[PDB]
Nucleic acid binder design. Structure first.
Length: 82
DNA sequence: AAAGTATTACAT
DNA sequence: ATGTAATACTTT
């Protein structure tokens, strides 16, 4: 069992907010990420979109509005030792 | 239509 | 994967 998405500083930071919530919808994601980190609504989206494109996260259009669901669970950033 | 929340593309 | 941008759908 290894890490699928390549984690970084900005990569992990957003995951934390998604994991804080059960899953997350763009308003909760942006609303949180914008207050915590610099990143504007534009800036925020790459960490979501590219991750999804490469398999880190997965989006789903749920009944009301959409939910971004963590496509990773076992890994959830494998911080290797020096 | 406005405001808010969702969705994907382009450039780096 | 990261930063930045554009556009659509949903609810009000």
């Amino acid at each position: 069992m290894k890490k699928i998405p390549q984690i970084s500083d900005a990569e992990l930071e957003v995951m934390k907010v998604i994991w804080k919530h059960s899953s997350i919808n763009t308003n909760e994601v942006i609303k949180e990420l914008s207050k915590t980190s610099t990143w504007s609504p534009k800036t925020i989206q790459t960490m979501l979109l590219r991750l999804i494109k490469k398999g880190a996260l997965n989006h789903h259009k749920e009944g009301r509005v959409f939910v971004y669901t963590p496509n990773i669970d076992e890994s959830d950033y494998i911080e290797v030792k020096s």
